[PDB]
């Protein structure tokens, strides 16, 4: 995350660092419940082990609170067009459930109509991760949160070189110095409506980081609802999509 404060205790308890074959994080997820983490389907390409440490807040200090889980099954939406980053989503099952505790609670999924009408018409959303604290500069060993304003579709279309597809929305700052960044992909976009936070997106992609004229692009989870939930009981194969 380029910009925006570190998350304090309490703060971002629905995070997941998808760690790799040794001990470095490379993407992010959301705890959806105690068996499934939500993430972007492009993440599943920079790893070999995607060992899910749930409970980790400030990397370096790799002391007790955290907990790596391994996975039982990963599912990528079949329609995930790979250099398109469309339908960029995966829910993955873990072998060992999440005993929620300090810094571990689930994030709520909305239902599609209340979500567009109420939630995504709100001004800002919160995005988080340990990813890069600047583009040409490295990884935060600290879980940071960025409060970011939803942009308008019409506007962020022009702004991209790549295709924003039906399945996408952008958010952030154009000129202001704060964005999502490298290694934050997958990590949560939550919207609070009067003290319940809901998941409005997955972190999808960007052209560089905290770029000028450029906004951050996220996977619009409203558009992804029934898929998540289908998979929620029959995991394995991608299905229909």
């Amino acid at each position: 995350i380029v910009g925006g404060r570190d998350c304090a205790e309490g703060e971002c308890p629905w995070q997941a660092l998808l760690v790799n074959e040794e001990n470095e994080g490379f993407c992010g997820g959301t705890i959806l419940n105690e068996f499934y983490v939500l993430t972007a389907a492009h993440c599943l390409h920079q790893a070999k082990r995607f060992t899910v440490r749930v409970g980790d807040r400030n990397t370096e200090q790799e002391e007790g609170n955290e907990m790596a889980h391994e996975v039982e099954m990963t599912v990528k939406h079949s329609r995930f067009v790979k250099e398109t980053y469309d339908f960029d989503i995966a829910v993955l099952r873990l072998k060992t459930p999440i005993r929620f505790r300090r810094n571990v609670a689930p994030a709520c999924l909305p239902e599609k109509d209340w979500a567009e009408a109420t939630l995504m018409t709100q001004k800002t959303g919160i995005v988080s991760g340990f990813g890069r604290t600047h583009e040409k500069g490295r990884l935060s060993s600290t879980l940071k949160m960025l409060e970011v304003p939803y942009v308008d579709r019409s506007t962020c279309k022009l702004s991209s070189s790549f295709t924003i597809t039906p399945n996408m929305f952008c958010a952030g700052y154009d000129t202001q110095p704060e964005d999502a960044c490298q290694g934050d992909s997958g990590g949560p976009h939550v919207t609070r409506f009067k003290d319940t936070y809901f998941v409005t997106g997955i972190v999808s992609w960007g052209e560089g980081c905290a770029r000028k004229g450029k906004f951050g692009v996220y996977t619009k989870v409203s558009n992804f609802l029934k898929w998540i939930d289908k998979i929620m009981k029959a995991r394995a194969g991608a299905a229909g999509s």
């Binding site: 703060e11 629905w14 994030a107 709520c108 999924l109 109420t118 409506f193 936070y197």
Partner: protein, 51 residues
């Protein structure tokens, strides 16, 4: 729905005339038709500690 979302603590729908508020997973609506009581101990979209 729309003005103050609908008198309910989270979801809302327009059922012929009326707003039919519901709740997210593991919240039971109140005998009003409006509030969603926390069923869990650490539930979805809540963050902090005690009191």
């Amino acid at each position: 729905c729309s003005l103050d979302n609908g008198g309910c603590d989270q979801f809302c729908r327009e059922e012929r005339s009326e707003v039919r508020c519901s709740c997210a997973h593991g919240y039971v609506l109140g005998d009003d038709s409006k509030s969603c009581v926390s069923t869990e101990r650490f539930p979805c979209g809540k963050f902090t500690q005690g009191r």
